Design an enzyme around this catalytic site. Structure first.
Site, PDB file in Angstrom:
ATOM      1  N   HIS A   1      61.019  42.448  35.616  1.00 26.36           N
ATOM      2  CA  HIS A   1      62.356  42.475  35.013  1.00 26.36           C
ATOM      3  C   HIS A   1      63.458  42.842  35.987  1.00 26.36           C
ATOM      4  CE1 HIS A   1      60.838  42.761  30.771  1.00 26.36           C
ATOM      5  NE2 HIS A   1      59.741  42.946  31.481  1.00 26.36           N
TER       6      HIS A   1
ATOM      7  N   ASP B   1      66.373  43.905  35.501  1.00 27.05           N
ATOM      8  CA  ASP B   1      66.980  45.187  35.190  1.00 27.05           C
ATOM      9  C   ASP B   1      66.057  46.372  35.353  1.00 27.05           C
ATOM     10  OD1 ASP B   1      65.710  44.171  32.904  1.00 27.05           O
ATOM     11  OD2 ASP B   1      67.335  44.816  31.548  1.00 27.05           O
TER      12      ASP B   1
ATOM     13  N   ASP C   1      56.186  44.346  37.139  1.00 27.82           N
ATOM     14  CA  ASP C   1      56.838  44.616  35.820  1.00 27.82           C
ATOM     15  C   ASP C   1      58.249  45.259  35.924  1.00 27.82           C
ATOM     16  OD1 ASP C   1      57.322  44.847  33.114  1.00 27.82           O
ATOM     17  OD2 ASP C   1      55.782  46.411  32.775  1.00 27.82           O
TER      18      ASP C   1
ATOM     19  N   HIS D   1      55.954  38.185  36.246  1.00 31.18           N
ATOM     20  CA  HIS D   1      56.357  39.163  35.246  1.00 31.18           C
ATOM     21  C   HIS D   1      56.962  40.394  35.904  1.00 31.18           C
ATOM     22  CE1 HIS D   1      55.820  40.795  31.001  1.00 31.18           C
ATOM     23  NE2 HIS D   1      56.369  41.786  31.679  1.00 31.18           N
TER      24      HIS D   1
ATOM     25  N   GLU E   1      50.391  44.633  25.027  1.00 27.69           N
ATOM     26  CA  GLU E   1      50.578  45.720  25.969  1.00 27.69           C
ATOM     27  C   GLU E   1      50.245  47.028  25.258  1.00 27.69           C
ATOM     28  OE1 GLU E   1      54.601  46.250  27.367  1.00 27.69           O
ATOM     29  OE2 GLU E   1      54.038  47.730  28.868  1.00 27.69           O
TER      30      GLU E   1
ATOM     31  N   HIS F   1      51.262  40.945  29.673  1.00 27.67           N
ATOM     32  CA  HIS F   1      50.307  42.037  29.478  1.00 27.67           C
ATOM     33  C   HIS F   1      49.013  41.563  28.816  1.00 27.67           C
ATOM     34  CE1 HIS F   1      53.401  44.858  30.824  1.00 27.67           C
ATOM     35  NE2 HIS F   1      54.225  44.165  30.056  1.00 27.67           N
TER      36      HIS F   1
ATOM     37  N   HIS G   1      55.737  38.867  25.548  1.00 26.35           N
ATOM     38  CA  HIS G   1      55.147  40.177  25.736  1.00 26.35           C
ATOM     39  C   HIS G   1      54.253  40.396  24.522  1.00 26.35           C
ATOM     40  CE1 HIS G   1      58.423  41.108  28.583  1.00 26.35           C
ATOM     41  NE2 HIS G   1      57.847  42.269  28.836  1.00 26.35           N
TER      42      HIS G   1
END
Length: 349
Positions: free
Chosen positions: A14, A16, A292, A12, A214, A235, A211
């Site tokens: 990202h 970006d 993350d 997990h 969270e 999460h 997701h």
């Protein structure tokens, strides 16, 4: 002095939210797109967070730099290449990295993200470009990297397309579909586009992660599990607020993709309470540790391992356990998965 200086698995993180500030600065200058700062340092300090914000303050950090990467073929392939480089240095032997291909396109995409000018980079193009960069990264750094394509909660109209892209690029390098974005968009798990896409995924054996929990209530985790048919929950800290649900998921051996440091800076964990992951460790839950969004959280995997070791009593043994669990819960086809477990065990000797 790194907390766990041995092979790790990350599930997990990202793409970006894991770009070098230098590369952002580079493309801002080359394209002549505005950045909120003009030196690596200050860029790193406006894009980054060292104090917990709200979820709106967190997501807002992307607006700063996404414009210089999106629509840029060279940048897209490059950040994927550089992603592998960073992780190999972190002692990661297998990682699944996720992004929205739509959010980096500037063609055949609506609405047009970041107010870009119509260009020639489609969301299909994007996946291809990230594939090339990650594949080049592998050839250069020698770790295994797969990708996950994100549906965005606020944009259920992109979801069937995200499913087609996971199908078309299955294992090359796409291993699954995610659902990301603003979790508190009321009833958004039930938007027909997400629902339909996840149903399409179940029918075609396209892996699924969601997701959930969270910042949402356990209901949002329940929806992810019983409605979207998710195989892993991103999460999920708030799952433990529901004894029954939690205990159900423990028994089904649900995987929780835990992001300790992240949970702190997004304000998703109240620092004055025991982290949910402490309960996961004590219950022998199935979970992994993940950075993350390391760019925004100014972090590497070690930050997270350091966190749980110093503050949550995590031992070499638990670090081992949980990476083996992450391996087993990975979206690798059966033979590659056996190879990963085989490599961990040999390297945990």
């Amino acid at each position: 002095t790194p907390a766990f200086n041995k092979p790790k698995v990350e599930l997990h993180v990202h793409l970006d939210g894991a770009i070098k500030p230098e590369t952002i600065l580079y493309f801002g200058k080359k394209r002549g797109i505005a950045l909120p700062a003009d030196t690596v340092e200050e860029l790193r300090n406006i894009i980054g967070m060292d104090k917990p914000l709200s979820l709106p303050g967190f997501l807002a950090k992307f607006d700063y730099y996404m414009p210089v990467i999106a629509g840029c073929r060279e940048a897209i392939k490059r950040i994927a290449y550089e992603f592998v480089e960073m992780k190999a240095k972190e002692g990661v032997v297998y990682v699944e990295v996720r992004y929205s291909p739509h959010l980096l396109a500037n063609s055949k995409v609506d609405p047009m993200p970041w107010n870009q000018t119509e260009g020639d980079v489609t969301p299909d193009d994007v996946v291809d470009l990230v594939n090339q960069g990650l594949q080049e990264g592998e050839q250069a750094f020698g770790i295994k990297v797969r990708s996950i394509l994100c549906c965005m909660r606020h944009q259920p109209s992109w979801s069937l397309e995200v499913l087609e892209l996971c199908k078309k690029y299955n294992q090359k390098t796409v291993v699954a579909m995610d659902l990301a974005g603003d979790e508190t968009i009321e009833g958004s798990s039930l938007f027909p586009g997400h629902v339909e896409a996840y149903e399409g995924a179940v029918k075609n054996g396209i892996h699924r992660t969601v997701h959930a929990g969270e910042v949402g209530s356990p209901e949002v985790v329940r929806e992810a599990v019983d409605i979207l048919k998710t195989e892993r929950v991103g999460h999920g800290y708030h799952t433990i607020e529901d004894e029954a649900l939690y205990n159900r998921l423990l028994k089904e051996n649900m995987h929780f993709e835990v992001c300790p440091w992240s949970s702190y800076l997004t304000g998703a964990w109240d620092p004055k309470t025991t982290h949910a992951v402490v309960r996961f460790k004590n219950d022998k839950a199935n979970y992994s540790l993940n950075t993350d969004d390391p760019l925004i959280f100014k972090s590497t995997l070690d930050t997270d391992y350091q966190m749980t070791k110093k503050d949550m009593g995590f031992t070499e043994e638990e670090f081992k356990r949980l990476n083996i669990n992450a391996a087993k819960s990975s979206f690798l086809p059966e033979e590659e998965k056996k190879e990963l477990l085989e490599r961990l065990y040999r390297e945990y000797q």
